[PDB]
Design a protein around this ligand. Structure first.
Ligand SMILES: CCNC(=O)[C@H]1O[C@@H](n2cnc3c(NCC(c4ccccc4)c4ccccc4)nc(C(=O)NCCNC(=O)NC4CCN(c5ccccn5)CC4)nc32)[C@H](O)[C@@H]1O
Ligand SMILES: CCCCCCCC/C=C\CCCCCCCC(=O)OC[C@H](O)CO
Length: 444
């Protein structure tokens, strides 16, 4: 069997695989309401782009490898679409990655930044850029201006109509490499967040939250950082002025993470001084190690000293280092009943003296980082070979040419992006995974 038959069969097989898997992803989000979030707005968009790739782009990419005689612009149109439909997938993928950057790195401002309306607005921007970039050759940047096929006709091959300086300068750098570098920067950032060094600052950030902008707290007072009240005055300018005084520089109501940590360490200093001046809490705070002290401070920040001093029985056990007995006793209060998540983490800290309960909470980010490593690795493996090949053909024509099977393999790889990248991310999600199981077992 000759090569062309192998290429078409493999290219067609990938088309079905790209269609089946991405139909599944949209099906799951369609019936399961736990998947009807804003993140999966982007996931479904990518699945749509990938169904079109399997339906239209792949048959086109095949077509523009047969070399039949065609009107130069009629063959140019075919080529540009496969460029459009594939651009649409790259940018759609980039939108998912960024949604995950904000969701993990900046969870408090996420729901505000990324809404259904903002999402559909971004998905729109993605397709508009895809058509603009993909159809640019039709504007005039084509190899058609100039025996074998006749006048006005050329042998319909990709390179015969699409210039190589468009594929290297415009298409590769601006629309393939940049997204990859962006997506890679996303992965590395989430990787450093998931594997971050833990401390009282990180503890309170997990329990209460970090805000690098000024915000009104539950009692309407302006606040910044981790619950650091600036002023009770209704004047935002006054809040901004108090902020500048504590920071030193002029902030405009915005600080860096490093500045919120200097505000926090000052609040911690304040909390300890109050603990040391409380006759009930002083003997216990002195008898604890650093990590358990941090958990005692966690309680002060939430209830104040008088509220902590009310735990006479639990405090007693802690001073005697009766960790287990102290824990079960603390599990009884209305503190636990009203904020069980936070109290359960604080108690585990008392019982173990480690950050365990607060490193367990980062496993969700660890899971997010590994899912993105797969996205960026598959993306680099699927797209770099083909575009590296173009770069060598454009900057060094006389160079040793790669064999036809490796060249066409790079094309196959570029189209395998549409079957792995969205689906693999979905399959790593328990909800998605269970929904896939439910639909295939029932309907199939
Ligand atoms: C969002 C981004 N989107 C994309 O990148 C999509 O665009 C398509 N694409 C992107 N570069 C593509 C591309 N480069 C051209 C490249 C090449 C050709 C074939 C296979 C891989 C790469 C090339 C290399 C060397 C010389 C010229 C072009 N050739 C095709 C595409 O069909 N070739 C099929 C039709 N041509 C051909 O048999 N020519 C042959 C290739 C072998 N001979 C050679 C070899 C060395 C030197 C000279 N003569 C004779 C011409 N398609 C491409 C593909 O669908 C991508 O998924
Ligand atoms: C983005 C739109 C950019 C459109 C750029 C058109 C480039 C053009 O028309 O000419 C390039 C020429 O082939 C270079 O040698």
């Amino acid at each position: 069997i000759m090569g062309s038959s192998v290429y078409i069969t493999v290219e067609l097989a990938i088309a079905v695989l790209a269609i089946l898997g991405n139909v599944l992803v949209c099906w799951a989000v369609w019936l399961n309401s736990n998947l009807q979030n804003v993140t999966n707005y982007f996931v479904v968009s990518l699945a749509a782009a990938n169904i079109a790739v399997g339906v239209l782009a792949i048959p086109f990419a095949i077509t523009i490898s047969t070399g039949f005689c065609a009107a130069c612009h009629g063959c140019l149109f075919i080529a540009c679409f496969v460029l459009v439909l594939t651009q649409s997938s790259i940018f759609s993928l980039l939108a998912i990655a960024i949604d995950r950057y904000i969701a993990i790195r900046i969870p408090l401002r996420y729901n505000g930044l990324v809404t259904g309306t903002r999402a559909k607005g971004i998905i729109a921007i993605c397709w508009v850029l895809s058509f603009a970039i993909g159809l640019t050759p039709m504007l005039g940047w084509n190899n058609c201006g100039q025996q074998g096929c006749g006048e006005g006709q050329v042998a319909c091959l990709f390179e015969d109509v699409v210039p190589m300086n468009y594929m290297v300068y415009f298409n590769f750098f601006a629309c393939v490499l940049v997204p990859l570098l962006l997506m890679l920067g996303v992965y590395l950032r989430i990787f450093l967040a998931a594997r971050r060094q833990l401390n009282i600052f990180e503890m309170l950030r997990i329990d209460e939250g970090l805000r690098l902008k000024i915000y009104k707290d539950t009692e309407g007072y302006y606040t910044i950082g981790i619950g650091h009240l600036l002023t009770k005055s209704p004047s935002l300018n006054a809040a901004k002025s108090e902020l500048d005084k504590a920071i030193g520089r002029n902030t405009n109501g915005v600080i860096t993470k490093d500045e919120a940590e200097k505000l926090f360490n000052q609040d911690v200093d304040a909390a300890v001084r109050g603990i040391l001046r409380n006759a009930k809490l002083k003997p216990v705070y002195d008898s604890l190690d650093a990590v358990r002290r941090a958990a005692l401070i966690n309680m002060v920040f939430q209830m104040g000293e008088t509220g902590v001093a009310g735990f006479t029985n639990s405090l007693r056990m802690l001073q005697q280092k009766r960790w287990d007995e102290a824990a079960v006793n603390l599990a009884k209060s209305r503190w636990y009943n009203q904020t069980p998540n936070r109290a359960k983490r604080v108690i585990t800290t008392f019982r173990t003296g480690t950050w365990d309960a607060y490193r367990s909470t980062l496993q969700k980010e660890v899971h997010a980082a590994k899912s993105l490593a797969i996205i960026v690795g598959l993306f680099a493996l699927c797209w770099l070979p083909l575009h590296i090949i173009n770069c060598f053909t454009f900057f060094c024509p006389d160079c040793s040419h790669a064999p036809l099977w490796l060249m066409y393999l790079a094309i196959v790889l570029s189209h395998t992006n549409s079957v792995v990248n969205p689906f693999i991310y979905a399959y790593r999600i328990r909800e998605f995974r269970q929904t896939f199981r439910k639909i295939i077992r029932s309907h199939v």
